[PDB]
Design a protein around this ligand. Structure first.
Ligand code: WYE
Length: 829
């Protein structure tokens, strides 16, 4: 169209944070070609969308209600409190009761159906043909022993979710290196050209060294061994510059999105370094044409023996990080069809394919066509993710992984959403099955869409390597989510943008001269700019309204984070506490997202085995670059603020925590409950942090609720080693003093092992989330050793006895250290 269309595209660009129509930094039309290609998948999903359920986005699981939540249901009954204007009942319900059956048990008890059950204060709906025990909110209240308060009102209008309608010979490969050109510059340099496929180097030619000047020309043809015929789809031409150190890199797809051999002149602006990270794989070029180093090039082109079957089974049995010897690869490949029967063998098997051989690749495709076994295998996420990491560039291979993800219920997609989004950094092409899966699942569920938005926007705002790709995916999604969401997103984006300017102008300018500037700026923004209401990005069901200027402060700390507090915009809120949101800058919150999300994954893992370690993965979302927001946990203090209250330099007292708990819990019952919550949470976080290798933390980065719930914060990181924090003040709450035993220190040791072995049951899953996390989220170019940590931490190989020993050993290391490490953080300061 015109003024309205162009304004709609302007609408999107503002939401995205990047102009998808911009073509300044491309050398082909892949991005555009991807924008067009994504239209069909979008429209199909939109055209299959059930309006009523999409508008009400019920949050549901199929998983059996955990044992520890069953025990919290006495007479096979669950009480619900319905509200009408000023009305309240309390219908006893069966855990197997459908919502519709309950309203039926309501209007009989005391347009008829024109009503629906909405959670009080929240934008959450308990609807659809689902046992009332299988709603997430209902499982939430149960865990927190809360009353399920539900207001009865009218179903939301599906009209609000309306959508605004719209080569190749037998010649060997060769590349011409013209030269390099950097405006501004140990004094020698050479260009290395790698043919890469799935992180593997198929062939590698180098140039002669030359003096390192602002303009170095070679004008040389690099001849490779591999013929043009044997180039696999997805092969990257990896161009790098060494001085013996790696300075710059850039990649070019040898085969494009149209299956055309890429030929012609290219001047590629490179990224500079400052070895396994995902950024090294990007096909995008550096946008900063002014300063970036440039590169110029020209393209112009029976039965299986018993002992061997046991060899194979052994190989297949090893963990992902276990390297395959050439001997192992030949065995796996030669016995393709026997390996095919073992879904767990796939990752290794396809790591055994010579991708530089067209004939081998074809045989491989003939293997995948023998779908049966794979297709009928039970969904194994851990295994599936392995096929979607950096070791796999082949479309067909990666596609069968995605195919397996299709059978994930929404609840499960949420658990892995952040990782799957990140996993797009490993796709050779912009338009991939993985991208479409995310897009498809985002448009089908509002809650998944919401988090898809922020996960994508998070990367677009701070990752120049992938922002272009993520923007095209984000736009596609935005064009199908409906108007209601486009409007809500618009508010959230504005709020965070206004709260940005504020948190920025404060760090520069804790005095009351700032307490004055703060309250003055908030009042100004509130009176005029800040929207009436907006959704909490890390808790979308919750609507935050007006500001409580009186409550808003500015935390004292290295960085100057804003501590805000909003009034809920929902009148039917069965409470009147404010929403506390922290707005921080100066730290990349993405790493924290990844950690918190692996934390939630750990909880579910523990749920599949009827365990609850009371972790507390608070809300945390990167909203722009270097900034973001963090949920404020009510009734919570830092472990340090409780100690440094006897407040001194160093000097920790063993029973200040206990005093604090007792002081904060009114009854010996509520206190004893807090002491139990502490035992669990403490165990949960000791295991969780040991496994992830982030256990050695210090006081002020560990918090506790007044209900005795422990939880770590700020996985910045922020500034003798200890496996994890288990200080004498923790132990004292458990009754033990260095060193003996108590009913609760025995419970602790028990839980830890139960939880630890539980995690080890899913070794492969964690291993692969760990390695991915590091490759897509962590600063450093991670080496093989960093990742090899999870192997060791999970005692790979060893039995459940040697393992239990290993961990209880760790527990003792901490006990022997006491306050040593904590005291050191001061001493060193
Ligand atoms: C003394 N002072 C302690 C912190 N504070 C809280 C008080 C109550 N709850 C809280 C917080 C809090 C804070 C932070 O959480 C983070 C998480 C990250 O990944 C990185 C970070 O830099 C932070 C961070 O600064 C988080 N929650 C859930 C206010 C009071």
């Amino acid at each position: 169209m015109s003024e309205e269309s162009q304004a709609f595209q302007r609408q999107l660009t503002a939401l995205i944070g990047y102009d998808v129509t911009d073509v300044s930094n491309v050398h082909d039309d892949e991005l555009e070609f991807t924008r067009r290609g994504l239209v069909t998948p979008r429209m199909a999903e939109v055209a299959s969308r059930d309006p009523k359920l999409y508008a009400m986005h019920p949050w549901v699981t199929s998983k059996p209600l955990p044992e520890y939540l069953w025990k919290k249901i006495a007479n096979n009954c669950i009480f619900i409190v319905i509200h009408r204007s000023t009305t309240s009942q309390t219908i006893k319900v069966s855990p197997d009761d459908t919502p519709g059956a309950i309203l039926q048990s309501f209007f009989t008890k005391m347009s008829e159906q024109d009503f629906v059950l909405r959670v009080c204060g929240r934008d959450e709906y308990l609807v659809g043909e689902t046992p009332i025990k299988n709603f997430q909110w209902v499982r939430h209240c149960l865990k927190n022993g809360e009353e399920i308060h539900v207001v009865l009102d009218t179903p939301p209008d599906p009209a609000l979710d309306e959508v605004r309608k719209e080569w190749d010979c037998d010649r060997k490969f060769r590349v011409k290196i013209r030269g390099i050109d950097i405006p501004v510059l140990d004094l020698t340099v050479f260009v290395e050209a790698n043919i890469q496929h799935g992180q593997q180097v198929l062939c590698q030619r180098r140039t002669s060294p030359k003096p390192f000047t602002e303009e170095v020309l070679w004008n040389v043809w690099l001849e490779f061994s591999i013929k043009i015929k044997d180039l696999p789809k997805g092969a990257l031409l990896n161009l790098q510059i060494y001085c013996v150190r790696l300075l710059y890199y850039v990649n070019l797809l040898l085969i494009d999105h149209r299956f055309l051999l890429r030929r012609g002149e290219y001047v590629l602006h490179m990224w500079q370094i400052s070895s396994f990270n995902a950024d090294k794989l990007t096909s995008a070029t550096n946008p900063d044409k002014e300063n970036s180093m440039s590169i110029s090039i020209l393209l112009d082109n029976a039965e299986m023996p018993n002992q061997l079957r046991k060899q194979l089974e052994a190989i297949i049995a090893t963990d992902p990080l276990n390297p395959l010897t050439a001997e192992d690869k030949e065995l796996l490949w030669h016995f393709r069809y026997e390996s095919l029967k073992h879904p767990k063998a796939y990752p290794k098997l396809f790591s055994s394919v010579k991708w530089g051989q067209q004939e081998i690749v074809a045989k491989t495709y003939q293997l995948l066509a023998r779908r049966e076994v794979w297709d009928q295998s039970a969904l194994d996420v851990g295994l599936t993710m392995q096929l979607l990491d950096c070791n796999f560039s082949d479309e067909n291979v990666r596609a069968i992984a995605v195919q397996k993800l299709e059978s994930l219920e929404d609840d499960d997609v949420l658990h892995y959403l952040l990782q799957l989004v990140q996993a797009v950094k490993f796709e050779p092409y912009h338009d991939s099955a993985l991208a479409r899966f995310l897009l498809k699942r985002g448009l089908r569920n509002k809650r998944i869409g919401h988090f898809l938005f922020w996960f994508l926007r998070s990367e677009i705002a701070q990752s120049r390597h992938y922002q272009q790709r993520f923007a095209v995916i984000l736009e596609a999604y935005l064009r199908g989510c409906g108007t209601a969401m486009l409007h809500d997103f618009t508010q959230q984006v504005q709020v965070i943008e206004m709260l940005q300017k504020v948190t920025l102008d404060i760090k520069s300018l804790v005095s009351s001269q700032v307490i004055s500037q703060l309250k003055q700026k908030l009042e100004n923004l509130q009176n005029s700019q800040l929207p009436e209401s907006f959704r909490v990005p890390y808790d979308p069901g919750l609507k935050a309204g007006a500001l409580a200027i009186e409550k808003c402060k500015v935390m004292a700390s290295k960085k100057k984070p804003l501590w805000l507090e909003f009034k809920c915009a929902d009148p039917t809120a069965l409470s009147n506490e404010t929403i506390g949101i922290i707005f921080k800058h100066g730290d990349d919150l993405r790493q924290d997202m990844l950690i918190l999300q692996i934390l939630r994954i750990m909880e579910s893992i523990w749920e599949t085995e009827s365990l609850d370690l009371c972790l507390l993965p608070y809300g945390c979302i990167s909203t722009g670059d270097k900034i973001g927001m963090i949920e404020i946990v009510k009734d919570a203090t830092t472990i340090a603020k409780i100690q440094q209250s006897v407040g001194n330099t160093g000097a920790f007292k063993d029973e200040v925590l206990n005093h604090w708990l007792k002081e904060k819990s009114p009854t010996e019952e509520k206190f004893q409950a807090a002491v139990e919550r502490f035992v669990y949470s403490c165990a949960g976080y000791c295991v969780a942090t040991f496994v992830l290798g982030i256990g050695d933390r210090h006081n002020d980065n560990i918090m506790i609720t007044e209900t005795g719930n422990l939880f770590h914060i700020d996985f910045g990181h922020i500034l003798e080693r200890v496996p994890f924090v288990l200080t004498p003040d923790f132990l004292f709450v458990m009754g033990t003093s260095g060193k003996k035993t108590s009913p609760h220190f025995q419970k602790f040791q028990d839980i830890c092992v139960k939880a630890y072995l539980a995690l080890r049951h899913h070794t492969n899953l964690l291993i692969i989330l760990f390695s991915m996390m590091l490759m897509t989220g962590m600063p450093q170019l991670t080496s093989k050793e960093d990742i090899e940590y999870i192997r060791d931490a999970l005692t790979v190989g060893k039995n459940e006895e040697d393992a239990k020993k290993y961990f209880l050993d760790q527990i003792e290391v901490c006990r022997d250290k006491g306050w040593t490490v904590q005291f050191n953080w001061f001493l060193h300061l």
